[PDB]
Design a protein around this ligand. Structure first.
Ligand SMILES: CCN(CC)C1CCN(Cc2cc(C#CCNc3ccccc3)cc(I)c2O)CC1
Ligand SMILES: [Zn+2]
Length: 195
């Protein structure tokens, strides 16, 4: 089955935000609002902001999951390729098969769904650091979009869901991702292809 990707702010006015990182050749993570698409290098830090209009209950959590974007591929589980799942680049918490990791959060949990077999990573929802207006989660994507036997050039979406302590839906947002060697160049190209 295919998880919903419908944008849903819910009772708390949940939505994502992204930094404005530009498109220099040196950039390692950059987001295109026009394409709703994040471009990043392999295993590099990707800051994603969480914004709400009101404070959700303690015990609320934030889950990230990847799916294939194209209709003819959406039912296939997104996972790391046969090379990367065996490269022993473990952080001690993430299963080596999982494409999406959360960086630097000791309370991250990783799920292999027993019915759909899909992977996800979930962390507790927390208020912003003192002085800040939003909370930032740092994600890593652990295969290239081009990885043979893995994504194999197929575009993916990341779906971020806000959940209660039971796992019930409180909010949802999503963005496309391309993991590539030169995110700046690729963002510029795709934005021009759209123009
Ligand atoms: C207009 C927005 N308005 C500005 C004044 C508010 C600014 C202040 N925010 C607070 C806020 C809270 C949470 C959370 C959580 C769950 N845990 C928890 C823990 C301890 C206690 C309670 C709850 C997430 C975010 I992201 C976040 O911005 C809510 C919105
Ligand atoms: Zn790979």
């Amino acid at each position: 089955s295919v998880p919903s990707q419908k944008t849903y702010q819910g009772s708390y006015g949940f939505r994502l935000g992204f930094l404005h990182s530009g498109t220099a050749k040196s950039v390692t993570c950059t987001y295109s609002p026009a394409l709703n698409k994040l471009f990043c290098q392999l295993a590099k830090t990707c800051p994603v902001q969480l914004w709400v209009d009101s404070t959700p209950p303690p015990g609320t959590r934030v889950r990230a999951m990847a799916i294939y974007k194209q209709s003819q591929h959406m039912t296939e589980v997104v996972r790391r390729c046969p090379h990367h799942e065996r490269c022993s680049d473990s952080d001690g918490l993430a299963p080596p098969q999982h494409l999406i990791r959360v960086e630097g959060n000791l309370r991250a949990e990783y799920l292999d769904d027993r019915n759909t077999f899909r992977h996800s990573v979930v962390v507790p929802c927390e208020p912003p650091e003192v002085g800040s207006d939003c909370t930032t989660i740092h994600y890593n994507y652990m295969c290239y979009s081009s990885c043979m036997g893995g994504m194999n050039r197929r575009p993916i979406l990341t779906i971020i869901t806000l959940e209660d302590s039971s796992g019930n839906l409180l909010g949802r947002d999503s963005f496309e991702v391309r993991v590539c060697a030169c995110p700046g160049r690729d963002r510029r190209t795709e934005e021009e292809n759209l123009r």
